[PDB]
Amino acid sequence: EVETFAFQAEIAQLMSLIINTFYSNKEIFLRELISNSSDALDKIRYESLTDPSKLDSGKELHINLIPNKQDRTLTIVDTGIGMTKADLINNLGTIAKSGTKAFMEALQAGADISMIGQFGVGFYSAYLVAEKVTVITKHNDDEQYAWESSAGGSFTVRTDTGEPMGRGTKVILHLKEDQTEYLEERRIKEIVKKHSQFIGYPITLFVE
Ligand SMILES: Cc1cn(-c2ccc(C(N)=O)cc2)c2c1C(=O)CC(C)(C)C2
Structure with a gap:
Protein backbone atom coordinates (compact mmCIF):
# COMPACT_ATOMS: atom_id res chain seq x y z
CA GLU A 1 0.00 0.00 0.00
CA VAL A 2 1.36 3.43 -1.10
CA GLU A 3 -0.06 6.44 0.85
CA THR A 4 -0.15 9.88 -0.92
CA PHE A 5 -0.11 13.13 1.10
CA ALA A 6 -0.35 16.82 0.24
CA PHE A 7 2.52 19.06 1.39
CA GLN A 8 1.37 21.97 3.56
CA ALA A 9 1.11 25.18 1.37
CA GLU A 10 4.36 26.75 2.84
CA ILE A 11 6.48 23.63 1.95
CA ALA A 12 5.04 23.40 -1.61
CA GLN A 13 5.88 27.19 -1.91
CA LEU A 14 9.49 26.50 -0.64
CA MET A 15 9.91 23.59 -3.12
CA SER A 16 8.65 25.78 -6.05
CA LEU A 17 11.11 28.62 -5.05
CA ILE A 18 14.08 26.12 -4.90
CA ILE A 19 13.13 24.56 -8.30
CA ASN A 20 12.33 27.83 -10.22
CA THR A 21 14.77 30.51 -8.79
CA PHE A 22 17.92 31.13 -10.88
CA TYR A 23 20.77 30.33 -8.43
CA SER A 24 24.11 28.91 -9.72
CA ASN A 25 25.61 27.97 -6.29
CA LYS A 26 23.76 24.56 -6.26
CA GLU A 27 26.73 22.65 -4.64
CA ILE A 28 25.53 23.75 -1.12
CA PHE A 29 22.88 20.89 -1.28
CA LEU A 30 25.64 18.39 -0.23
CA ARG A 31 26.69 20.27 2.93
CA GLU A 32 22.98 20.54 3.91
CA LEU A 33 22.34 16.78 3.56
CA ILE A 34 25.66 15.93 5.33
CA SER A 35 24.56 18.38 8.16
CA ASN A 36 21.18 16.50 8.48
CA SER A 37 23.18 13.17 8.68
CA SER A 38 25.67 14.63 11.27
CA ASP A 39 22.73 15.90 13.47
CA ALA A 40 21.03 12.43 13.24
CA LEU A 41 24.36 10.74 14.21
CA ASP A 42 24.80 13.16 17.19
CA LYS A 43 21.23 12.21 18.36
CA ILE A 44 21.73 8.40 18.33
CA ARG A 45 25.26 8.79 19.91
CA TYR A 46 23.82 10.96 22.75
CA GLU A 47 20.84 8.61 23.35
CA SER A 48 23.26 5.60 23.48
CA LEU A 49 25.14 7.15 26.48
CA THR A 50 22.08 6.59 28.78
CA ASP A 51 20.73 3.47 26.87
CA PRO A 52 23.57 1.38 25.17
CA SER A 53 20.93 -1.03 23.65
CA LYS A 54 20.02 1.82 21.17
CA LEU A 55 23.18 0.72 19.23
CA ASP A 56 21.96 -2.97 18.96
CA SER A 57 20.78 -1.92 15.42
CA GLY A 58 24.43 -0.98 14.56
CA LYS A 59 27.49 0.38 16.47
CA GLU A 60 29.12 2.14 13.42
CA LEU A 61 28.45 5.93 13.19
CA HIS A 62 29.28 7.07 9.65
CA ILE A 63 28.27 8.81 6.39
CA ASN A 64 28.63 7.18 2.91
CA LEU A 65 28.37 9.11 -0.39
CA ILE A 66 27.45 6.77 -3.25
CA PRO A 67 27.37 7.99 -6.90
CA ASN A 68 25.68 5.82 -9.58
CA LYS A 69 26.15 7.02 -13.20
CA GLN A 70 23.91 4.21 -14.69
CA ASP A 71 20.91 5.20 -12.44
CA ARG A 72 21.91 8.97 -12.40
CA THR A 73 21.66 8.97 -8.57
CA LEU A 74 23.73 10.38 -5.70
CA THR A 75 22.95 8.63 -2.36
CA ILE A 76 23.81 10.07 1.11
CA VAL A 77 23.71 7.20 3.65
CA ASP A 78 24.02 7.63 7.43
CA THR A 79 23.69 5.34 10.46
CA GLY A 80 21.99 8.15 12.46
CA ILE A 81 18.82 7.95 14.60
CA GLY A 82 16.58 7.61 11.47
CA MET A 83 12.97 8.77 11.22
CA THR A 84 9.68 7.22 12.39
CA LYS A 85 6.47 7.29 10.24
CA ALA A 86 5.23 10.23 12.48
CA ASP A 87 8.54 12.13 11.74
CA LEU A 88 8.07 11.62 7.95
CA ILE A 89 4.37 12.60 7.74
CA SER A 114 22.80 29.18 0.78
CA MET A 115 21.51 30.30 4.27
CA ILE A 116 18.65 27.62 4.05
CA GLY A 117 20.25 25.41 6.83
CA GLN A 118 19.91 28.21 9.44
CA PHE A 119 16.09 27.77 9.11
CA GLY A 120 16.22 23.93 9.57
CA VAL A 121 14.82 23.26 6.05
CA GLY A 122 18.24 22.42 4.44
CA PHE A 123 16.89 18.98 3.31
CA TYR A 124 14.77 20.82 0.63
CA SER A 125 18.05 22.16 -1.01
CA ALA A 126 18.16 18.58 -2.53
CA TYR A 127 15.65 20.01 -5.14
CA LEU A 128 18.43 22.38 -6.46
CA VAL A 129 19.97 19.27 -8.17
CA ALA A 130 17.31 16.48 -8.00
CA GLU A 131 14.10 16.01 -10.04
CA LYS A 132 13.02 13.35 -7.44
CA VAL A 133 14.15 12.53 -3.89
CA THR A 134 13.67 9.09 -2.26
CA VAL A 135 14.27 8.82 1.49
CA ILE A 136 14.70 5.29 2.96
CA THR A 137 14.76 5.41 6.75
CA LYS A 138 14.78 3.17 9.82
CA HIS A 139 14.35 4.39 13.42
CA ASN A 140 14.69 1.95 16.40
CA ASP A 141 11.03 2.53 17.47
CA ASP A 142 9.50 1.89 13.98
CA GLU A 143 9.56 -0.04 10.61
CA GLN A 144 11.68 0.74 7.48
CA TYR A 145 9.91 3.36 5.28
CA ALA A 146 10.35 4.89 1.85
CA TRP A 147 9.32 8.59 1.47
CA GLU A 148 9.33 10.05 -2.08
CA SER A 149 8.54 13.30 -3.90
CA SER A 150 9.06 14.86 -7.36
CA ALA A 151 7.44 18.03 -5.84
CA GLY A 152 4.14 19.06 -7.56
CA GLY A 153 2.50 19.43 -4.11
CA SER A 154 2.58 15.77 -3.02
CA PHE A 155 4.73 13.06 -1.39
CA THR A 156 4.29 9.31 -0.87
CA VAL A 157 5.11 7.04 2.12
CA ARG A 158 5.25 3.21 1.92
CA THR A 159 6.76 0.36 4.03
CA ASP A 160 10.12 -0.40 2.36
CA THR A 161 10.63 -4.00 1.06
CA GLY A 162 14.26 -3.31 -0.07
CA GLU A 163 17.57 -4.28 1.64
CA PRO A 164 17.17 -3.92 5.53
CA MET A 165 19.30 -1.01 6.84
CA GLY A 166 19.57 -1.77 10.58
CA ARG A 167 19.19 1.97 11.49
CA GLY A 168 19.65 5.29 9.70
CA THR A 169 18.68 7.18 6.56
CA LYS A 170 19.46 6.95 2.81
CA VAL A 171 18.70 10.14 0.78
CA ILE A 172 18.61 9.10 -2.93
CA LEU A 173 18.89 12.08 -5.29
CA HIS A 174 17.55 11.32 -8.79
CA LEU A 175 19.62 14.04 -10.46
CA LYS A 176 18.35 16.51 -13.09
CA GLU A 177 19.84 15.84 -16.61
CA ASP A 178 22.16 18.94 -16.40
CA GLN A 179 23.44 18.17 -12.80
CA THR A 180 25.55 15.00 -13.53
CA GLU A 181 28.77 16.83 -12.31
CA TYR A 182 27.64 15.71 -8.77
CA LEU A 183 28.38 12.02 -9.82
CA GLU A 184 32.10 12.87 -10.50
CA GLU A 185 34.60 11.77 -7.78
CA ARG A 186 36.77 14.95 -8.05
CA ARG A 187 33.64 17.22 -7.85
CA ILE A 188 32.26 15.45 -4.73
CA LYS A 189 35.78 15.47 -3.05
CA GLU A 190 36.04 19.26 -3.81
CA ILE A 191 32.58 20.01 -2.25
CA VAL A 192 33.23 17.84 0.89
CA LYS A 193 36.66 19.56 1.46
CA LYS A 194 35.15 23.10 0.96
CA HIS A 195 31.97 22.83 3.10
CA SER A 196 32.15 19.62 5.25
CA GLN A 197 35.87 19.11 6.24
CA PHE A 198 35.19 19.22 10.06
CA ILE A 199 32.14 16.82 10.27
CA GLY A 200 32.75 14.60 13.35
CA TYR A 201 31.98 11.29 11.57
CA PRO A 202 33.86 9.41 8.80
CA ILE A 203 32.64 10.42 5.33
CA THR A 204 33.46 7.71 2.75
CA LEU A 205 33.12 8.68 -0.90
CA PHE A 206 32.35 5.47 -2.81
CA VAL A 207 33.84 5.10 -6.28
CA GLU A 208 32.24 3.56 -9.40
C1 LIG B 1 12.68 19.41 7.82
C2 LIG B 1 13.20 18.07 7.37
C3 LIG B 1 14.36 17.50 7.78
N1 LIG B 1 14.52 16.26 7.19
C4 LIG B 1 15.56 15.32 7.50
C5 LIG B 1 16.24 14.65 6.48
C6 LIG B 1 17.21 13.70 6.79
C7 LIG B 1 17.52 13.42 8.12
C8 LIG B 1 18.54 12.38 8.46
N2 LIG B 1 18.37 11.72 9.57
O1 LIG B 1 19.49 12.16 7.67
C9 LIG B 1 16.85 14.12 9.14
C10 LIG B 1 15.88 15.05 8.84
C11 LIG B 1 13.42 16.03 6.37
C12 LIG B 1 12.59 17.13 6.46
C13 LIG B 1 11.34 17.13 5.67
O2 LIG B 1 10.50 18.01 5.80
C14 LIG B 1 11.08 15.96 4.75
C15 LIG B 1 11.64 14.61 5.23
C16 LIG B 1 10.87 14.13 6.47
C17 LIG B 1 11.50 13.56 4.13
C18 LIG B 1 13.13 14.79 5.57
Whole structure:
Protein backbone atom coordinates (compact mmCIF):
# COMPACT_ATOMS: atom_id res chain seq x y z
CA GLU A 1 0.00 0.00 0.00
CA VAL A 2 1.36 3.43 -1.10
CA GLU A 3 -0.06 6.44 0.85
CA THR A 4 -0.15 9.88 -0.92
CA PHE A 5 -0.11 13.13 1.10
CA ALA A 6 -0.35 16.82 0.24
CA PHE A 7 2.52 19.06 1.39
CA GLN A 8 1.37 21.97 3.56
CA ALA A 9 1.11 25.18 1.37
CA GLU A 10 4.36 26.75 2.84
CA ILE A 11 6.48 23.63 1.95
CA ALA A 12 5.04 23.40 -1.61
CA GLN A 13 5.88 27.19 -1.91
CA LEU A 14 9.49 26.50 -0.64
CA MET A 15 9.91 23.59 -3.12
CA SER A 16 8.65 25.78 -6.05
CA LEU A 17 11.11 28.62 -5.05
CA ILE A 18 14.08 26.12 -4.90
CA ILE A 19 13.13 24.56 -8.30
CA ASN A 20 12.33 27.83 -10.22
CA THR A 21 14.77 30.51 -8.79
CA PHE A 22 17.92 31.13 -10.88
CA TYR A 23 20.77 30.33 -8.43
CA SER A 24 24.11 28.91 -9.72
CA ASN A 25 25.61 27.97 -6.29
CA LYS A 26 23.76 24.56 -6.26
CA GLU A 27 26.73 22.65 -4.64
CA ILE A 28 25.53 23.75 -1.12
CA PHE A 29 22.88 20.89 -1.28
CA LEU A 30 25.64 18.39 -0.23
CA ARG A 31 26.69 20.27 2.93
CA GLU A 32 22.98 20.54 3.91
CA LEU A 33 22.34 16.78 3.56
CA ILE A 34 25.66 15.93 5.33
CA SER A 35 24.56 18.38 8.16
CA ASN A 36 21.18 16.50 8.48
CA SER A 37 23.18 13.17 8.68
CA SER A 38 25.67 14.63 11.27
CA ASP A 39 22.73 15.90 13.47
CA ALA A 40 21.03 12.43 13.24
CA LEU A 41 24.36 10.74 14.21
CA ASP A 42 24.80 13.16 17.19
CA LYS A 43 21.23 12.21 18.36
CA ILE A 44 21.73 8.40 18.33
CA ARG A 45 25.26 8.79 19.91
CA TYR A 46 23.82 10.96 22.75
CA GLU A 47 20.84 8.61 23.35
CA SER A 48 23.26 5.60 23.48
CA LEU A 49 25.14 7.15 26.48
CA THR A 50 22.08 6.59 28.78
CA ASP A 51 20.73 3.47 26.87
CA PRO A 52 23.57 1.38 25.17
CA SER A 53 20.93 -1.03 23.65
CA LYS A 54 20.02 1.82 21.17
CA LEU A 55 23.18 0.72 19.23
CA ASP A 56 21.96 -2.97 18.96
CA SER A 57 20.78 -1.92 15.42
CA GLY A 58 24.43 -0.98 14.56
CA LYS A 59 27.49 0.38 16.47
CA GLU A 60 29.12 2.14 13.42
CA LEU A 61 28.45 5.93 13.19
CA HIS A 62 29.28 7.07 9.65
CA ILE A 63 28.27 8.81 6.39
CA ASN A 64 28.63 7.18 2.91
CA LEU A 65 28.37 9.11 -0.39
CA ILE A 66 27.45 6.77 -3.25
CA PRO A 67 27.37 7.99 -6.90
CA ASN A 68 25.68 5.82 -9.58
CA LYS A 69 26.15 7.02 -13.20
CA GLN A 70 23.91 4.21 -14.69
CA ASP A 71 20.91 5.20 -12.44
CA ARG A 72 21.91 8.97 -12.40
CA THR A 73 21.66 8.97 -8.57
CA LEU A 74 23.73 10.38 -5.70
CA THR A 75 22.95 8.63 -2.36
CA ILE A 76 23.81 10.07 1.11
CA VAL A 77 23.71 7.20 3.65
CA ASP A 78 24.02 7.63 7.43
CA THR A 79 23.69 5.34 10.46
CA GLY A 80 21.99 8.15 12.46
CA ILE A 81 18.82 7.95 14.60
CA GLY A 82 16.58 7.61 11.47
CA MET A 83 12.97 8.77 11.22
CA THR A 84 9.68 7.22 12.39
CA LYS A 85 6.47 7.29 10.24
CA ALA A 86 5.23 10.23 12.48
CA ASP A 87 8.54 12.13 11.74
CA LEU A 88 8.07 11.62 7.95
CA ILE A 89 4.37 12.60 7.74
CA ASN A 90 3.80 15.13 10.56
CA ASN A 91 6.65 16.07 13.02
CA LEU A 92 9.32 17.32 10.55
CA GLY A 93 6.63 19.04 8.41
CA THR A 94 5.45 21.03 11.51
CA ILE A 95 9.03 22.36 12.18
CA ALA A 96 9.52 22.82 8.37
CA LYS A 97 6.41 25.17 8.15
CA SER A 98 7.82 27.70 10.72
CA GLY A 99 11.35 27.36 9.23
CA THR A 100 10.03 28.07 5.68
CA LYS A 101 8.13 31.24 6.80
CA ALA A 102 11.35 32.63 8.44
CA PHE A 103 13.53 31.60 5.40
CA MET A 104 11.19 33.14 2.76
CA GLU A 105 10.96 36.35 4.95
CA ALA A 106 14.85 36.47 5.15
CA LEU A 107 15.07 35.97 1.29
CA GLN A 108 12.65 38.97 0.81
CA ALA A 109 15.02 41.00 3.15
CA GLY A 110 18.13 40.17 1.02
CA ALA A 111 19.43 36.76 2.31
CA ASP A 112 20.52 34.14 -0.22
CA ILE A 113 19.45 30.47 -0.80
CA SER A 114 22.80 29.18 0.78
CA MET A 115 21.51 30.30 4.27
CA ILE A 116 18.65 27.62 4.05
CA GLY A 117 20.25 25.41 6.83
CA GLN A 118 19.91 28.21 9.44
CA PHE A 119 16.09 27.77 9.11
CA GLY A 120 16.22 23.93 9.57
CA VAL A 121 14.82 23.26 6.05
CA GLY A 122 18.24 22.42 4.44
CA PHE A 123 16.89 18.98 3.31
CA TYR A 124 14.77 20.82 0.63
CA SER A 125 18.05 22.16 -1.01
CA ALA A 126 18.16 18.58 -2.53
CA TYR A 127 15.65 20.01 -5.14
CA LEU A 128 18.43 22.38 -6.46
CA VAL A 129 19.97 19.27 -8.17
CA ALA A 130 17.31 16.48 -8.00
CA GLU A 131 14.10 16.01 -10.04
CA LYS A 132 13.02 13.35 -7.44
CA VAL A 133 14.15 12.53 -3.89
CA THR A 134 13.67 9.09 -2.26
CA VAL A 135 14.27 8.82 1.49
CA ILE A 136 14.70 5.29 2.96
CA THR A 137 14.76 5.41 6.75
CA LYS A 138 14.78 3.17 9.82
CA HIS A 139 14.35 4.39 13.42
CA ASN A 140 14.69 1.95 16.40
CA ASP A 141 11.03 2.53 17.47
CA ASP A 142 9.50 1.89 13.98
CA GLU A 143 9.56 -0.04 10.61
CA GLN A 144 11.68 0.74 7.48
CA TYR A 145 9.91 3.36 5.28
CA ALA A 146 10.35 4.89 1.85
CA TRP A 147 9.32 8.59 1.47
CA GLU A 148 9.33 10.05 -2.08
CA SER A 149 8.54 13.30 -3.90
CA SER A 150 9.06 14.86 -7.36
CA ALA A 151 7.44 18.03 -5.84
CA GLY A 152 4.14 19.06 -7.56
CA GLY A 153 2.50 19.43 -4.11
CA SER A 154 2.58 15.77 -3.02
CA PHE A 155 4.73 13.06 -1.39
CA THR A 156 4.29 9.31 -0.87
CA VAL A 157 5.11 7.04 2.12
CA ARG A 158 5.25 3.21 1.92
CA THR A 159 6.76 0.36 4.03
CA ASP A 160 10.12 -0.40 2.36
CA THR A 161 10.63 -4.00 1.06
CA GLY A 162 14.26 -3.31 -0.07
CA GLU A 163 17.57 -4.28 1.64
CA PRO A 164 17.17 -3.92 5.53
CA MET A 165 19.30 -1.01 6.84
CA GLY A 166 19.57 -1.77 10.58
CA ARG A 167 19.19 1.97 11.49
CA GLY A 168 19.65 5.29 9.70
CA THR A 169 18.68 7.18 6.56
CA LYS A 170 19.46 6.95 2.81
CA VAL A 171 18.70 10.14 0.78
CA ILE A 172 18.61 9.10 -2.93
CA LEU A 173 18.89 12.08 -5.29
CA HIS A 174 17.55 11.32 -8.79
CA LEU A 175 19.62 14.04 -10.46
CA LYS A 176 18.35 16.51 -13.09
CA GLU A 177 19.84 15.84 -16.61
CA ASP A 178 22.16 18.94 -16.40
CA GLN A 179 23.44 18.17 -12.80
CA THR A 180 25.55 15.00 -13.53
CA GLU A 181 28.77 16.83 -12.31
CA TYR A 182 27.64 15.71 -8.77
CA LEU A 183 28.38 12.02 -9.82
CA GLU A 184 32.10 12.87 -10.50
CA GLU A 185 34.60 11.77 -7.78
CA ARG A 186 36.77 14.95 -8.05
CA ARG A 187 33.64 17.22 -7.85
CA ILE A 188 32.26 15.45 -4.73
CA LYS A 189 35.78 15.47 -3.05
CA GLU A 190 36.04 19.26 -3.81
CA ILE A 191 32.58 20.01 -2.25
CA VAL A 192 33.23 17.84 0.89
CA LYS A 193 36.66 19.56 1.46
CA LYS A 194 35.15 23.10 0.96
CA HIS A 195 31.97 22.83 3.10
CA SER A 196 32.15 19.62 5.25
CA GLN A 197 35.87 19.11 6.24
CA PHE A 198 35.19 19.22 10.06
CA ILE A 199 32.14 16.82 10.27
CA GLY A 200 32.75 14.60 13.35
CA TYR A 201 31.98 11.29 11.57
CA PRO A 202 33.86 9.41 8.80
CA ILE A 203 32.64 10.42 5.33
CA THR A 204 33.46 7.71 2.75
CA LEU A 205 33.12 8.68 -0.90
CA PHE A 206 32.35 5.47 -2.81
CA VAL A 207 33.84 5.10 -6.28
CA GLU A 208 32.24 3.56 -9.40
C1 LIG B 1 12.68 19.41 7.82
C2 LIG B 1 13.20 18.07 7.37
C3 LIG B 1 14.36 17.50 7.78
N1 LIG B 1 14.52 16.26 7.19
C4 LIG B 1 15.56 15.32 7.50
C5 LIG B 1 16.24 14.65 6.48
C6 LIG B 1 17.21 13.70 6.79
C7 LIG B 1 17.52 13.42 8.12
C8 LIG B 1 18.54 12.38 8.46
N2 LIG B 1 18.37 11.72 9.57
O1 LIG B 1 19.49 12.16 7.67
C9 LIG B 1 16.85 14.12 9.14
C10 LIG B 1 15.88 15.05 8.84
C11 LIG B 1 13.42 16.03 6.37
C12 LIG B 1 12.59 17.13 6.46
C13 LIG B 1 11.34 17.13 5.67
O2 LIG B 1 10.50 18.01 5.80
C14 LIG B 1 11.08 15.96 4.75
C15 LIG B 1 11.64 14.61 5.23
C16 LIG B 1 10.87 14.13 6.47
C17 LIG B 1 11.50 13.56 4.13
C18 LIG B 1 13.13 14.79 5.57
